[PDB]
Design a binder for this molecule. Structure first.
Ligand SMILES: CCCCCCCCCCCC(=O)OC[C@H](COP(=O)(O)OCC[N+](C)(C)C)OC(=O)CCCCCCCCCCC
Ligand SMILES: CCCCCCCCCCCC(=O)OC[C@H](COP(=O)(O)OCC[N+](C)(C)C)OC(=O)CCCCCCCCCCC
Ligand SMILES: CCCCCCCCCCCC(=O)OC[C@H](COP(=O)(O)OCC[N+](C)(C)C)OC(=O)CCCCCCCCCCC
Ligand SMILES: CCCCCCCCCCCC(=O)OC[C@H](COP(=O)(O)OCC[N+](C)(C)C)OC(=O)CCCCCCCCCCC
Ligand SMILES: CCCCCCCCCCCC(=O)OC[C@H](COP(=O)(O)OCC[N+](C)(C)C)OC(=O)CCCCCCCCCCC
Ligand SMILES: CCCCCCCCCCCC(=O)OC[C@H](COP(=O)(O)OCC[N+](C)(C)C)OC(=O)CCCCCCCCCCC
Ligand SMILES: CCCCCCCCCCCC(=O)OC[C@H](COP(=O)(O)OCC[N+](C)(C)C)OC(=O)CCCCCCCCCCC
Ligand SMILES: CCCCCCCCCCCC(=O)OC[C@H](COP(=O)(O)OCC[N+](C)(C)C)OC(=O)CCCCCCCCCCC
Ligand SMILES: CCCCCCCCCC(=O)OC[C@H](COP(=O)(O)OCC[N+](C)(C)C)OC(=O)CCCCCCCCC
Ligand SMILES: CCCCCCCCCC(=O)OC[C@H](COP(=O)(O)OCC[N+](C)(C)C)OC(=O)CCCCCCCCC
Ligand SMILES: CCCCCCCCCC(=O)OC[C@H](COP(=O)(O)OCC[N+](C)(C)C)OC(=O)CCCCCCCCC
Ligand SMILES: CCCCCCCCCC(=O)OC[C@H](COP(=O)(O)OCC[N+](C)(C)C)OC(=O)CCCCCCCCC
Ligand SMILES: CCCCCC(=O)OC[C@H](COP(=O)(O)OCC[N+](C)(C)C)OC(=O)CCCCC
Ligand SMILES: CCCCCC(=O)OC[C@H](COP(=O)(O)OCC[N+](C)(C)C)OC(=O)CCCCC
Ligand SMILES: CCCCCC(=O)OC[C@H](COP(=O)(O)OCC[N+](C)(C)C)OC(=O)CCCCC
Ligand SMILES: CCCCCC(=O)OC[C@H](COP(=O)(O)OCC[N+](C)(C)C)OC(=O)CCCCC
Ligand SMILES: CCCCCCCCCC
Ligand SMILES: CCCCCCCCCC
Ligand SMILES: [Cu+2]
Ligand SMILES: [Cu+2]
Ligand SMILES: [Cu+2]
Ligand SMILES: [Cu+2]
Ligand SMILES: [Cu+2]
Lengths: 236, 382, 241, 236, 123, 51, 52
């Protein structure tokens, strides 16, 4: 069996959900979504914000908790074939994390940019903030935390210690979320200009660099893959 | 000599020098040449240049081939930086004393605190004689007359040589013994603690004490001699008195202004309205140190530099006298080799294709009026 | 190897002279680059040698190389002249350029374009390191002395240039008249970073306050550049590039 | 034999060539060299620039290539006396490098300074740039690279690895040459003032500090000198 | 892509990271503007637009209104008293090449640190 | 302000000083697409050769 | 002008006058674009009720 079709679902769920989100914001961007003080905004976007925050908290709690209670206690008595299967499942988790990172840190982030040269901001909760700051960033944070927890609880290589590159890869991109405080403060009191290269945005940049720990994470996963199931073939 | 490299549009709209005059063209050593004139600060001062809140009236020359004896803005000496107001006209005067023999291109320039140098027209001045004859006497408030060419030179030489000799003596004292490899090997192989032993410490104490004592004694001696000293005098001078020019009775609207690429001419269409009570005629167009003259209306007698002067470079389609109250539209062409020699045609490279300049209108009795024009300058290729 | 003990001594002496040349002139080049692009403008002009900016800035930026060269030379050979060799090299390069280019090429007078004196501070830094071989003690006391003695060391040179003059109705010192007369096309009067007076300053306290600020900042700069020189003294052989 | 008279030539060639260069610029500084748009400038200084760049490229290629092909393959079978002679030749190379560094980084650099308070710049190729940026800097770069290559190819101590202090001493002072891009950019768009202490010039300063690696280089050469020919005498 | 290709090929050939940081980063900085010139050259055709000279790109920016980004926010070359018209791009390109050498040198070691595989025995 | 019609009808003509009339809606679009696609294909070819 | 020379606690003293801003304002001082009319005293021995 080895790599199963959980990978197809992992790609497809993010793709379908974010295509629906893009359609939703393309329909309710103008026409209930330009004016933040209108009552139609309160039902089409503030409700979206509240619902997405509640669902994010609930989903994160359920997913991380389930992964933690179902952790493997007898890691020593794990066959190499089962370890290979678990390594492939962890690779699927990493694929889902990469897809979520793309959607959050590239697509919706530069989409907030398009909106920055068309409107004048009315609040910290513009239609694009609902989708980028409070939906896609939490989604990729949840996925990354889940991948880290899965590695730590199922893979013996990633057990017996917290991996530093994995911790950086999981937490640094998370640190962009509290960095939104810098964004709003850096737009209100500081730089009233809609400059997208202002130092107010370097907070995302600094913690966007921490995603380069994916390289250390990936060589760690390669070594975990090549523990018992290294071959043979490889190096022969 | 620094112009022809600056942006043409910024040479056109920073400062307009006119009524320039040079007292002499050829001088001997220690003789004086006086440069006078007016400069107008352009109202459309470019944003990339800081406003002339801190400006210095400088002279463009290859080092001190002349010494600046005096310089005036308005009627008052300006040895420090000054504050100029955008839109105002000032008269200036620079007095130079010849120092080095040769043929020198002397410019009147203005340095702005945040925008760089604004170079005016340059005139070739010949200096004859020998540099050994140059004197720069000055009388102090302490009652002493000194020559600035060699005052304090011996004292400076002595003190620098003395301290250099002290340092060389220290190094040589340590350099009489072997220097690098044996000392490195001794420090490496066990404790060294043998390469620095008395009386080395005594010699170092002597050097330190002698240095401090000599510094203190020399300072006290230099306070007994020259008991009266003042700090360096500095500070921008406000309150520059500008010229109170009469309001022009000529109004000119630049309706479209173009230039050929390539070419040596600039063409503009002007609607000139003549107020007042005297028939006027356009006699000059000044754009950036370049004077385009209509020889039938005005002739230059001030010895303006020939390469910057186009005696018949200004052609007006209808330059008949303009009766008072009458308004008309004419086509004006400013053509000269100076337009390409001074790279006024390099405006096509600039990120701001706008020009500015001065038009001089003359009536029958001879009195003249200065009007300022600025407009977009559109290249034409076909 | 060498034939005898005498030949080895002769070889070591030849090595000493050649390596001293190498150290001296590499230091001259690099130190002169650093100085002329950190304090050069004040060092060029007597009308720039003021009581606030010149006094404050010159020792701070000039104590860099002596600290590093001391940290190397004293530690590896017990040679107490890193500061002195740095300062003498800077002075030699400066004076060669002043005489052959500032006065030779262009004709700025030497009494206008003389450099600043630094040997007293260098001597203090070297002797305080030799005696009491503590680098910390040097960084605190010798750097203090280096910062403090700068202006008094230069006062015998620049004091005659501070004599007041009535020049066409304005009060000027001799150095001011030098700067006014000998035209510098590239450097106007406003570029001059000199003491201009503030509403929070005293006339007869500017120089000592600047000297003490320079001494404290020299302590800091010496401390940093001691370790910079320590790193530059490494002998590692990277097994590539 | 040991130290021969190549040292006299090493000092004299730089001295004579740079005295001729100084005479040349003292004659053609004014009078074909003030105006950059004049045709006499194009024949007295632009031709100088072109010729010197071509000669520098050719000389660097020839010198470095010859030093590299004539490298010692049998470094193990080298007598201590021959090693001492090669160490002295390397010291002569270091002396030439120090002399070239002086001429480039002190003399002509502060000479560019004298010109900065007498003219108004017309270009990046003023008579002083021809001599300082494009002649003396390449000359000392060539000398330093040649010294490094000679050490690596003739001295067993400097073989079997690239010396870090030597690499810094050779490359950092080189980095001043591409730091000319900062100089011109820092004078055109930035600081129009002819300040010689502006932050636009700290690029030379930062890489002028790297010449302090001469200390590590020199202790390495001292150790190379004291490998077999340390004595005896020394430490006895 | 042209700069990336230069950086990659110069690293592969002559596997020296120092040689890459000096030569490949230089090429990356230098080839940027010539690589983009075939795209933006048609947008630099001069136009007489209501009495003012504008390039096509300027008219694009003027016409297609950006509420959030006005004209002054534009950080573009405006000309100085110390600059030459037909020398701006090469000077900027060489400054970018030198600064790219510096940035490549720093970020090579930043990536080296990010490639670590340590297992901290906690948080 | 109400706008009626279709966005496909919008034209933004402009006459250059070189004597050419272009539509700002689609001028240089094909050239931009071509050059970006060409360089992207070059990079993809490099990576695929190694892959 | 000073309204009083000797006052009791809780009593009021009024200080009036004119000030002219000098045209030759020194360059080392920023122009009084942002200026505060203050009172020089050793701490709040008086309280500033009003200032005009
Ligand atoms: C990591 C954990 C993430 C948790 C957060 C996820 C956010 C989900 C969306 C929030 C919606 C909200 O809050 O808004 C509720 C909106 C408000 O619109 P309305 O006024 O009803 O108008 C009608 C709007 N139509 C035309 C879109 C119906 O209506 C709804 O009922 C529709 C919400 C459907 C969400 C489920 C489909 C997702 C795509 C399919 C693949 C997964
Ligand atoms: C328990 C789960 C559900 C609730 C979840 C929270 C949703 C938002 C609640 C808003 C309440 C309120 O009062 O609004 C917000 C009030 C202003 O209010 P206003 O001026 O009336 O806004 C009117 C305009 N609208 C209708 C669009 C809101 O202040 C603020 O701008 C707070 C801004 C904080 C910015 C930085 C946040 C960084 C987060 C980092 C995370 C790691
Ligand atoms: C090992 C350390 C050795 C230090 C040697 C110091 C020599 C003394 C110089 C006298 C200073 C002076 O005379 O007054 C101060 C003058 C400034 O005067 P001015 O504003 O230019 O006035 C011009 C008119 N003149 C010519 C009369 C001056 O000089 C200075 O600003 C340097 C001040 C540094 C002195 C600090 C010494 C305090 C002790 C150190 C304690 C830890
Ligand atoms: C670790 C700290 C140890 C302190 C040792 C102090 C020794 C002083 C030697 C005499 C110097 C002198 O007399 O000269 C000081 C000169 C005076 O300058 P002037 O008034 O401008 O002009 C010259 C006037 N004469 C000719 C009369 C001198 O410079 C200064 O202004 C510096 C004075 C402030 C020093 C602050 C030190 C604080 C130390 C605190 C210890 C707890
Ligand atoms: C690391 C490798 C470095 C490579 C570059 C070296 C640069 C060499 C000079 C470039 C000259 C140029 O390009 O100009 C050529 C100049 C142009 O002047 P002209 O118009 O003929 O006027 C007459 C000029 N006189 C009066 C100087 C003749 O004339 C020449 O034929 C003279 C060039 C002689 C160079 C060789 C002598 C060097 C000094 C002796 C000790 C070595
Ligand atoms: C193959 C060997 C021979 C050629 C060698 C190169 C010589 C120079 C060629 C100039 C061509 C040209 O077009 O000039 C240069 C054009 C401007 O031209 P302009 O305005 O007409 O100049 C007229 C004035 N003059 C007559 C004095 C030239 O742009 C530039 O300013 C480019 C400036 C770049 C500055 C940063 C360089 C950093 C280098 C770093 C190295 C590690
Ligand atoms: C491995 C490295 C590969 C580098 C490949 C370089 C391709 C050559 C491009 C020609 C430049 C040009 O043609 O002139 C300069 C033009 C600027 O012109 P503009 O101001 O926009 O004028 C508009 C009018 N046009 C359309 C005619 C230009 O472009 C540049 O500013 C980039 C300058 C970088 C060139 C540096 C090359 C020097 C050799 C490198 C040495 C170490
Ligand atoms: C390690 C250093 C090696 C140097 C190798 C140099 C190879 C040059 C290849 C030809 C480039 C060309 O001809 O083009 C250069 C273009 C000219 O641009 P333009 O005048 O604006 O317009 C285009 C005009 N054309 C169409 C006529 C080209 O860009 C530049 O301005 C850069 C010129 C300055 C280069 C400074 C290099 C200094 C090196 C010093 C070595 C000691
Ligand atoms: C608590 C801080 C107060 C200041 C003390 C800091 C000095 C510490 C330096 C240090 O670590 O010791 C190095 C030498 C050791 O030499 P010793 O062999 O201990 O010599 C002792 C005899 N002596 C008094 C003449 C020195 O000893 C010395 O450094 C010299 C000691 C004499 C003090 C004066 C020297 C400084 C002159 C400016
Ligand atoms: C302006 C800042 C000053 C520059 C000083 C920084 C020096 C950094 C140290 C360094 O370069 O590390 C070299 C390693 C490559 O190691 P190796 O080549 O394996 O050498 C083995 C021994 N060693 C690991 C200790 C080096 O890392 C590498 O990948 C090789 C790069 C070497 C470049 C150093 C040259 C610096 C010249 C400017
Ligand atoms: C003193 C500084 C002058 C420049 C030299 C810096 C290059 C140093 C790089 C290095 O450390 O060596 C790595 C490789 C080693 O490969 P080798 O097995 O030595 O190949 C030799 C045959 N070859 C000439 C085709 C290369 O050799 C190479 O890197 C390639 C050597 C060929 C030079 C041209 C390559 C660069 C192309 C842009
Ligand atoms: C924005 C800057 C980039 C962040 C990179 C900084 C990483 C610093 C390295 C670090 O975290 O050290 C961990 C130690 C705790 O050590 P231990 O948990 O005892 O691990 C034993 C092995 N070890 C000592 C080598 C780690 O120190 C501790 O007390 C644990 C703290 C670990 C926090 C690191 C997570 C960084 C995520 C942003
Ligand atoms: C790898 C990221 C793909 C992002 C594609 C995207 O944003 O799609 C939205 C956009 C919307 O434009 P359009 O297709 O015309 O449909 C408009 C519907 N709304 C306005 C809701 C987006 O086009 C599509 O839906 C194409 C489907 C691509 C599948 C990978
Ligand atoms: C890593 C480079 C950081 C450089 C910071 C920068 O570009 O700041 C520009 C800004 C200059 O403000 P400006 O660009 O004129 O802003 C114009 C718009 N307002 C006036 C509303 C802020 O300066 C500051 O206020 C200090 C920044 C501290 C950085 C740690
Ligand atoms: C350690 C660096 C020596 C620099 C000396 C220098 O720049 O010399 C040029 C200068 C030029 O002045 P001068 O001797 O009067 O001859 C003028 C000739 N030109 C104008 C071509 C320099 O003086 C000399 O030639 C003296 C010879 C010193 C030999 C070490
Ligand atoms: C290590 C100390 C660096 C301090 C930088 C500095 O002194 O910059 C002065 C300059 C202030 O400009 P100013 O001195 O007023 O320049 C006047 C001349 N113009 C207006 C032509 C630039 O500030 C900047 O533009 C930012 C510098 C960033 C350094 C990384
Ligand atoms: C700012 C001074 C830092 C100097 C670096 C020294 C590192 C030494 C490591 C061996
Ligand atoms: C500014 C670049 C510093 C990068 C840090 C790398 C540290 C590596 C330690 C193993
Ligand atoms: Cu936003
Ligand atoms: Cu001139
Ligand atoms: Cu004017
Ligand atoms: Cu220069
Ligand atoms: Cu008043």
């Amino acid at each position: 069996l080895l790599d199963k079709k959980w990978l197809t679902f992992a790609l497809a769920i993010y793709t379908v959900f974010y295509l629906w989100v893009r359609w939703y914001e393309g329909v309710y961007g103008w026409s209930a979504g330009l004016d933040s003080f209108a009552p139609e905004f309160e039902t089409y976007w503030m409700n979206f914000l509240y619902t997405e925050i509640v669902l994010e908290i609930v989903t994160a709690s359920i997913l991380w908790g389930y992964l933690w209670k179902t952790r493997d206690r007898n890691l020593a008595a794990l066959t190499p074939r089962e370890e290979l299967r678990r390594n492939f499942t962890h690779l699927v988790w990493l694929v889902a994390y990469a897809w979520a990172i793309y959607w959050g840190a590239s697509y919706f982030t530069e989409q907030d940019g398009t909106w920055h040269q068309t409107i004048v901001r009315d609040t910290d909760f513009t239609p694009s903030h609902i989708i980028e700051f409070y939906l896609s960033y939490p989604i990729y944070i949840i996925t990354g935390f889940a991948a880290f927890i899965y590695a730590k609880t199922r893979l013996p290589f990633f057990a017996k210690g917290i991996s530093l590159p994995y911790l950086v890869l999981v937490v640094g991109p998370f640190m962009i979320l509290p960095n939104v405080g810098l964004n709003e403060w850096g737009h209100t009191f500081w730089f009233m200009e809609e400059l997208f290269v202002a130092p107010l945005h370097y907070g995302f940049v600094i913690f966007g660099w921490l995603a380069l720990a994916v390289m250390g994470t990936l060589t760690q996963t390669f070594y975990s893959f090549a523990q018992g199931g290294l071959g043979q073939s490889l190096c022969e | 000599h620094g112009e022809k490299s600056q942006a043409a549009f910024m040479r056109m709209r920073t400062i307009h020098w006119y009524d320039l005059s040079w007292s002499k063209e050829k001088v001997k050593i220690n003789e004086t040449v006086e440069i006078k004139g007016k400069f107008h600060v352009f109202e459309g001062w470019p944003e990339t240049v800081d406003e002339p809140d801190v400006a210095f009236l400088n002279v463009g020359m290859p080092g001190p081939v002349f010494i600046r004896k005096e310089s005036y803005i308005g009627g008052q000496l300006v040895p420090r930086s000054v504050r100029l107001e955008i839109g105002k006209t000032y008269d200036f005067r620079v007095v130079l004393k010849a120092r080095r023999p040769g043929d020198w291109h002397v410019h009147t320039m203005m340095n702005v605190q945040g925008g760089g140098p604004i170079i005016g027209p340059g005139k070739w001045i010949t200096v004859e004689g020998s540099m050994s004859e140059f004197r720069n006497p000055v009388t102090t408030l302490t009652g002493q007359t000194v020559d600035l060419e060699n005052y304090n030179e011996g004292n400076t030489y002595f003190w620098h040589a003395f301290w250099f000799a002290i340092g060389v003596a220290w190094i040589g004292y340590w350099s009489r013994r072997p220097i690098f490899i044996p000392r490195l090997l001794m420090v490496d192989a066990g404790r060294a603690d043998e390469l620095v032993s008395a009386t080395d410490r005594k010699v170092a104490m002597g050097f330190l004490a002698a240095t401090i004592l000599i510094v203190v004694m020399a300072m006290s001696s230099a306070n007994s001699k020259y008991p009266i000293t003042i700090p360096l005098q500095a500070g921008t001078m406000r309150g520059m008195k500008p010229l109170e020019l009469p309001a022009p009775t000529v109004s000119v609207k630049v309706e479209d202004a173009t230039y050929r690429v390539p070419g040596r001419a600039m063409r503009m269409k002007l609607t000139i309205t003549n107020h007042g009570n005297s028939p006027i005629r356009l006699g000059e167009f000044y754009t950036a140190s370049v004077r385009f003259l209509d020889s039938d209306v005005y002739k230059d007698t001030t010895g303006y530099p020939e390469d910057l002067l186009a005696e018949d470079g200004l052609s007006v389609s209808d330059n008949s006298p303009l009766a008072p109250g009458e308004t008309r539209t004419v086509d004006v062409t400013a053509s000269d080799a100076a337009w390409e020699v001074y790279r006024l045609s390099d405006i096509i490279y600039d990120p701001d294709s706008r020009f500015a300049g001065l038009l001089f209108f003359f009536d029958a009795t001879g009195n003249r009026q200065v009007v300022q024009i600025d407009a977009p300058l559109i290249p034409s290729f076909m | 190897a060498v034939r005898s003990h005498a030949e080895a001594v002769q070889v070591s002496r030849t090595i000493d002279w050649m390596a001293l040349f190498v150290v001296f002139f590499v230091i001259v080049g690099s130190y002169h680059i650093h100085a002329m692009l950190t304090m050069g403008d004040w060092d060029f002009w007597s009308d720039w040698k003021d009581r606030r900016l010149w006094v404050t800035v010159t020792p701070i930026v000039l104590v860099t190389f002596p600290a590093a060269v001391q940290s190397y030379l004293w530690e590896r050979y017990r040679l107490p002249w890193g500061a002195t060799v740095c300062v003498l090299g800077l002075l030699l390069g400066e004076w060669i350029n002043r005489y052959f280019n500032f006065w030779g090429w262009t004709y700025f007078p030497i009494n206008f374009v003389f450099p600043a004196s630094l040997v007293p501070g260098a001597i203090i830094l070297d002797t305080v390191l030799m005696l009491s071989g503590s680098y910390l003690f040097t960084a605190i006391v010798g750097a203090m002395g280096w910062g403090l003695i700068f202006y008094p060391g230069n006062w015998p040179i620049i004091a005659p240039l501070h004599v007041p003059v009535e020049y066409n109705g304005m009060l000027m010192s001799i150095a001011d008249i030098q700067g006014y007369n000998y035209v510098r096309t590239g450097t106007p009067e406003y570029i001059r970073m000199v003491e201009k007076g503030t509403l929070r300053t005293f006339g007869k306290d500017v120089a000592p306050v600047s000297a003490f600020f320079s001494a404290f900042m020299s302590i800091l700069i010496y401390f940093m550049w001691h370790f910079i020189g320590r790193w530059f003294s490494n002998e590692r052989f990277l097994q590539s590039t």
